[PDB]
Structure formats: structure tokens, C-alpha cells
Amino acid sequence: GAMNSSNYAELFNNDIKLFVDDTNVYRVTVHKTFEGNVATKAINGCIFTLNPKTGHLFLKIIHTSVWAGQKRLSQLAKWKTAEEVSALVRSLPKEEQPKQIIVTRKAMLDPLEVHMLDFPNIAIRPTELRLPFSAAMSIDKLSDVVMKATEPQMVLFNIYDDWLDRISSYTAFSRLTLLLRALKTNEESAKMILLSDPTITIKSYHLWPSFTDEQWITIESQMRDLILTEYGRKYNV
Amino acid sequence: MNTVPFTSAPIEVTIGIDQYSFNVKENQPFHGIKDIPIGHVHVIHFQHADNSSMRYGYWFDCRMGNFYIQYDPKDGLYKMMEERDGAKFENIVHNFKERQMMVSYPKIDEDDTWYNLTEFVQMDKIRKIVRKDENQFSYVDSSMTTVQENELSDPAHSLNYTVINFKSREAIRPGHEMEDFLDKSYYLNTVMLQGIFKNSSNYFGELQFAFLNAMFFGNYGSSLQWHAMIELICSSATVPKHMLDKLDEILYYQIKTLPEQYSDILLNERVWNICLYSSFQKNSLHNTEKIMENKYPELL
Numbered sequence: 172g173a174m175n176s177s178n179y180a181e182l183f184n185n186d187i188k189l190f191v192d193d194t195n196v197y198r199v200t201v202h203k204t205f206e207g208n209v210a211t212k213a214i215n216g217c218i219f220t221l222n223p224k225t226g227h228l229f230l231k232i233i234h235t236s237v238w239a240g241q242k243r244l245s246q247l248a249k250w251k252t253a254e255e256v257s258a259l260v261r262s263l264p265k266e267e268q269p270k271q272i273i274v275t276r277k278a279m280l281d282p283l284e285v286h287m288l289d290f291p292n293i294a295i296r297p298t299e300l301r302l303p304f305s306a307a308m309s310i311d312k313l314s315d316v317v318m319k320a321t322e323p324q325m326v327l328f329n330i331y332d333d334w335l336d337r338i339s340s341y342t343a344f345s346r347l348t349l350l351l352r353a354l355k356t357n358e359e360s361a362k363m364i365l366l367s368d369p370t371i372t373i374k375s376y377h378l379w380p381s382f383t384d385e386q387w388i389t390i391e392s393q394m395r396d397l398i399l400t401e402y403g404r405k406y407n408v
Numbered sequence: 409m410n411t412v413p414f415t416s417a418p419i420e421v422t423i424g425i426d427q428y429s430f431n432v433k434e435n436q437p438f439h440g441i442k443d444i445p446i447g448h449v450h451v452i453h454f455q456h457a458d459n460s461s462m463r464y465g466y467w468f469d470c471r472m473g474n475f476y477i478q479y480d481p482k483d484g485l486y487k488m489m490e491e492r493d494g495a496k497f498e499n500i501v502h503n504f505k506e507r508q509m510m511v512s513y514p515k516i517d518e519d520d521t522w523y524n525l526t527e528f529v530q531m532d533k534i535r536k537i538v539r540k541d542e543n544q545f546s547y548v549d550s551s552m553t554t555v556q557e558n559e560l561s562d563p564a565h566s567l568n569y570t571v572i573n574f575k576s577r578e579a580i581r582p583g584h585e586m587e588d589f590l591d592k593s594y595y596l597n598t599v600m601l602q603g604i605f606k607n608s609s610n611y612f613g614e615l616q617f618a619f620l621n622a623m624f625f626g627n628y629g630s631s632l633q634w635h636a637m638i639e640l641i642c643s644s645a646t647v648p649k650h651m652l653d654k655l656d657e658i659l660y661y662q663i664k665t666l667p668e669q670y671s672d673i674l675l676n677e678r679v680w681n682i683c684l685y686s687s688f689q690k691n692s693l694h695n696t697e698k699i700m701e702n703k704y705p706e707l708l
């Protein structure tokens with residue numbers, strides 16, 4: 172069934188699973204026309220498909236050309252997402268294929284289910300969690316590769332950098348979701364927190380700074396402050 | 409005009425014959441129904457006074473044999489049987505008519521309801537949905553499950569309706585996933601109509617049979633079949649214009665005949681609101697939409 176706080180440890184067991192987020196697949200800017208009407212201009216987007224146990228982010232870049240001449244784009248985006256996820260699964264060796272795919276928005280269930288009719292034994296599931304994966308385009312290196320793409324392209328990232336060398340996948344996912352929740356509630360503050368100290372750097376092959384265990388506790392603490400505050404500044408409490 | 413005689417009526421029972429129903433008291437001197445119109449299928453059905461559980465009955469066509477009803481005290485129900493000796497049967501029926509022990513099929517002459525509900529229903533097709541080939545007539549009751557139901561437990565006693573499933577490989581062409589799921593014309597016109605049913609008369613025949621089994625026996629699997637067959641047409645952007653015109657008429661008379669006090673269970677809100685207000689054919693069912701709005705504006 173659906174995924175929630177009750178069955179939260181299942182994410183880190185040994186059954187292969189992928190989260191799919193489609194929030195950033197169809198992205199637009201809205202603007203005025205010379206005639207004073209309103210139009211949209213599409214910009215590049217991405218499918219966010221993540222193995223929560225390993226940190227494996229399969230980032231499929233959706234180039235604006237995929238929309239040319241198409242109608243009902245927000246609906247097509249969901250089916251485009253499902254077609255790409257199905258293609259990804261088919262490209263993996265049988266022993267790497269997921270046993271479950273969890274979608275972050277329920278509108279993806281039927282499109283993905285239909286594209287995966289050939290995989291009766293892969294479970295397609297929703298979730299009751301409010302996962303902050305939409306903030307993925309607030310990660311600078313991810314945003315940069317999406318916006319520079321001139322054609323469809325799949326980019327492979329580890330969203331945990333090297334963390335699994337020191338921490339478990341439960342703790343890494345918890346840190347990720349904390350960082351992304353912060354970025355989503357106050358991007359400017361979140362980012363000031365992460366790069367305030369010039370001496371801490373991001374390795375060329377990493378997404379996040381190289382923080383000591385001790386510096387992560389301070390960082391993680393600073394992110395929880397932000398999320399509480401901005402909830403006051405937003406709820407006057 | 410043909411006759412379904414009864415040997416006797418040993419247990420108090422409500423008897424229905426097509427859309428009409430009448431009560432018979434325990435051991436009342438009842439010997440059947442006469443004046444049954446030739447040229448249509450018919451259904452004779454039963455609800456015992458003691459046990460309102462299990463409505464059951466028999467689909468039959470008097471052109472295909474001489475049939476009578478006889479209570480079986482071992483199995484505890486009124487059983488349809490065929491009499492092969494034609495001279496024996498005529499003589500029995502003639503004696504019961506002379507003593508006036510049979511009620512009369514009360515067909516108002518202006519009344520086309522039963523024709524409009526069974527227009528496309530054939531006994532030969534009924535018999536393939538209801539398998540029991542040593543009999544010319546077909547038993548149905550409230551509890552019988554459908555083939556697709558058993559896929560989600562006795563096959564001999566199943567209703568073998570055509571399985572329809574919108575998220576299936578039969579329904580969805582590789583590479584046309586979005587197209588075929590949002591517009592089911594392929595599945596309607598090519599898979600089902602051309603492939604399985606051959607023509608729309610056979611499709612409409614199964615649809616009408618499913619509704620009647622839902623309405624007369626409260627057969628839940630039949631109600632699911634009826635709604636699915638409606639939904640597949642309403643969800644197809646491309647449907648022959650004659651099929652849409654006939655569908656509107658079919659559904660009109662089904663909605664018209666439905667008991668008001670059963671509409672809450674026999675009608676699926678989601679299907680009807682989608683078919684009438686969201687689907688490709690939202691504008692194609694004028695008679696059906698008008699009677700639904702005047703008779704069940706609540707459901708909507």
C-alpha cells in the first residue's frame with residue numbers, strides 16, 4: 172500500500188526500490204506578450220529518480236524540445252516521466268531492477284502502472300510523506316547540468332556524496348531530507364548556512380561540502396533552526 | 409403465446425417474470441404463467457418468503473422447448489425443467505388453463521419496455537456466459553461470481569462475461585500507453601468489437617444481460633460488467649454514430665426501469681458522472697442524461 176511514517180524503515184532494507192519525483196519535469200516561466208496577454212516559456216527540467224539505500228540519483232534531463240508542438244503539457248509530463256522510468260528499468264540488469272517504485276505524487280500512479288504492465292512483479296506505490304525532492308533544483312551542481320543541457324541526457328550522481336562511509340542509509344536519508352526541506356523553506360538562508368565558512372569546500376565529484384562529523388551536527392542543527400523559525404515567520408508563533 | 413406451467417407452489421414465494429412480480433402463498437393453488445410473448449428471451453425468478461437471501465431464476469426462450477417449474481424439496485428451490493413429450497405438455501397446460509390456475513403475462517399493448525431491455529439479448533449468447541449445456545435454459549442467482557472476479561471460486565457456477573480491464577496489455581498497445589489509456593477507441597473498436605464480439609449487437613447483448621442480472625438478482629459482478637461496458641464506450645473518442653445513438657436508448661430504458669429504492673447500490677457514481685459530464689461522449693447521451701438528472705439528481 173501507501174508509504175508513510177509507520178513503514179519508514181522499509182526504505183533501507185535490502186529490496187531494491189526507487190523514489191520517482193516528477194515535480195521538476197515540466198518547468199515554465201510565465202510572461203506577458205506584446206499584446207498584453209500571458210504566455211509560458213518552458214525551461215529544461217528533470218526526473219528525480221533516487222535509490223534511498225545507496226544514494227544513486229538517476230537524473231534524467233528533460234530538454235524543452237520534448238514539448239514542441241505538444242498539447243496538455245502538464246498531463247504529458249506525467250506520461251513522459253513514466254516512459255523514461257520504464258525505459259530506465261528495462262535498461263538495468265534483472266538483478267538491479269527495483270522491486271518497488273514509490274512515486275511522490277499520486278497522479279504518477281496510473282501513468283507509471285500503465286508503462287510498467289510488462290513488470291507485474293514491480294510494485295508501484297504512493298506515499299503519505301511530504302518529501303522535499305522538489306528542492307533538488309536548489310542544489311547548484313544539479314541545477315547547472317539541467318540548465319546547460321542542449322539535448323536529452325541522463326546524468327548519474329550520488330546524492331549522499333561519501334556519507335555512507337561513515338553513516339547508515341537511514342541517517343543519510345534523514346540528513347538529505349533535512350537539507351532539502353531547509354532549501355525548500357528558505358533557499359537563501361539554507362545556502363548561506365552551507366557555504367558561510369570559506370574553509371569548507373565541495374569536492375569536484377560531490378554535491379555538498381566536505382563537513383566533519385562534528386561540523387555536520389552543527390550544520391544539521393542550523394538547518395532545524397531555519398525550518399522552525401520560517402515556520403514562525405510563516406505562522407507568526 | 410406460450411406457457412410456463414408449475415407443478416405446484418409448496419413454499420411461499422415472490423415470483424417475477426421479466427419486469428413484473430407477484431406473490432404466491434404456501435400451498436396456494438398456483439399452476440403457472442400463461443400468455444408469455446413469443447419472440448423474446450424471458451426470465452422467471454424467485455425470492456422465498458422465509459429467506460430473502462438468494463434471489464435466483466432462469467433465462468429461457470419458449471421457442472427452444474417446453475419448460476415447466478417444479479419445487480425440489482431436497483435442494484429447496486423451484487427448478488426449471490424441460491418436458492420432451494410434447495403431447496403430454498399440451499395436455500397438462502390445457503387442463504390448467506381450463507381450471508384457470510395460471511396468472512397471465514400482463515403485457516400492456518402500448519408497452520415496449522421488455523423489448524427495449526432485451527433488444528440485443530439472445531439465448532445462444534446467454535448460454536455461453538452461463539455454462540450448463542445439458543439445459544436449454546440458464547440459471548443465475550445473486551451469489552454467482554464472474555470469471556474476472558475469480559481472478560481477483562467455483563468455475564462451473566461462474567458468469568463468463570467478457571473480461572474488460574483498462575490497465576492491461578490487451579487494452580494498451582506498446583508505445584501507445586498514454587494514447588490508449590486516455591482514449592480507449594483502440595480497445596473498444598479493434599480489440600473488443602472487431603476481435604471479441606464481432607459486432608455491436610453482441611456487445612449490446614452482453615451489456616443488457618449484465619444489467620438485467622444486476623437488477624433482478626442484485627448480482628454484484630454483473631453490475632460491475634454493465635458499468636465497465638458503458639465506461640469503455642464513453643471513454644472512446646471514436647465510436648460509430650449508430651452505436652452512440654443506440655447506447656443512449658438502451659441506457660434510457662434501463663434507468664427508466666430501475667427501482668428507485670435500489671438506485672443507491674446498482675448505480676456507480678463515478679462511472680455515471682464521468683460518462684455524462686467528463687468523457688468524450690458527455691454530449692452524446694441526451695435521453696440518458698435527461699432521465700438521470702430528473703430521476704436521480706442526487707447521485708449527481
Ligand SMILES: NCC(=O)N1CCc2sccc2C1
Pocket residue numbers: 226227228229327328329
Ligand atoms: N559509487 C557509485 C555511484 O554512486 N554511482 C554510480 C552508479 C549510479 S546509477 C545512478 C547514480 C549512480 C551513482
Ligand SMILES: NCC(=O)N1CCc2sccc2C1
Pocket residue numbers: 425428429430431441511512513514
Ligand atoms: N404485482 C401485482 C400482482 O400481484 N400481479 C401483477 C403482475 C403479475 S404478472 C402475473 C400475475 C401478476 C399479478
